Amino acid sequence: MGPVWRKHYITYRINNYTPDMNREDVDYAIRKAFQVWSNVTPLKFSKINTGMADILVVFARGAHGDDHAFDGKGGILAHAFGPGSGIGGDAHFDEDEFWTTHSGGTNLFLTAVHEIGHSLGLGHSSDPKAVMFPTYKYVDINTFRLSADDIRGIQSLYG
Ligand SMILES: COc1ccc(S(=O)(=O)N(CC(=O)NO)CC(C)C)cc1
Ligand SMILES: [Ca+2]
Ligand SMILES: [Ca+2]
Ligand SMILES: [Ca+2]
Ligand SMILES: [Zn+2]
Ligand SMILES: [Zn+2]
């Protein structure tokens, strides 16, 4: 298995906020995305507002300091680093996308669930029902669930 957090208590911080959405709606999407994974593992997530966090959530465009520049509107939507110090764990969202609460543009919650999966150590899935399948597809958020493959994947890393 690839890198995992060697602890079950994991912190996150939102570095900055997309102007595409209201701040409250970003906070909500991210909280809900962590909750998806917390609900199927022994992992506990704590949001910090200031200071050192394990998982930094970042909205940025183009070349943004890591060796993985974004590519403008479309194409790559987001990427994340597996567990580790510093940039390890961090989840970055391409600001050249239009982030949304809904089925228009790119749904932040669904994208964040996938990215946090990477921040926890998951790779891509070959199951098209898995959130870790590497194509963005809107699905009804109120009825969203991890697939059996996503749960196998994350439980193989933690618990
Ligand atoms: C549901 O969340 C997704 C997040 C990013 C992408 S993506 O298209 O940017 N992409 C990059 C990636 O996997 N980042 O995590 C896949 C791809 C082009 C292989 C697709 C789906
Ligand atoms: Ca980090
Ligand atoms: Ca892009
Ligand atoms: Ca944007
Ligand atoms: Zn990046
Ligand atoms: Zn991915």
The type of residue at 156 is S
Print the SS3 string covering the chain: CCCCCCCCEEEEEECCCCCCCCHHHHHHHHHHHHHHHHCCCCCEEEECCCCCCCEEEEEECCCCCCCCCCCCCCCCCEEECCCCCCCCCCEEEECCCCEECCCCCEEHHHHHHHHHHHHCCCCCCCCCCCCCCCCCCCCCHHHCCCCHHHHHHHHHHCC
| Listed resolution, Å | 1.3
Positive or negative: CA dihedral 151, 30, 5, 60: positive
Does the annotation mark 115 as catalytic?
A: yes
Of the candidates 13, 99, 109, 115, the residue annotated as catalytic is 115
Instruction: Ligand 1, residue 132: give the atom nearest the CA.
Output: 1
Please tell me if the CB atom of residue 69 comes closer than 6 angstroms to any atom of ligand 1.
Answer: no
CA 46 to chain centroid, in Å, comes to: 15
- Does the domain at 1-159 match CATH 3.40.390.10? Answer given as yes
What kind of experiment solved this structure?
X-ray
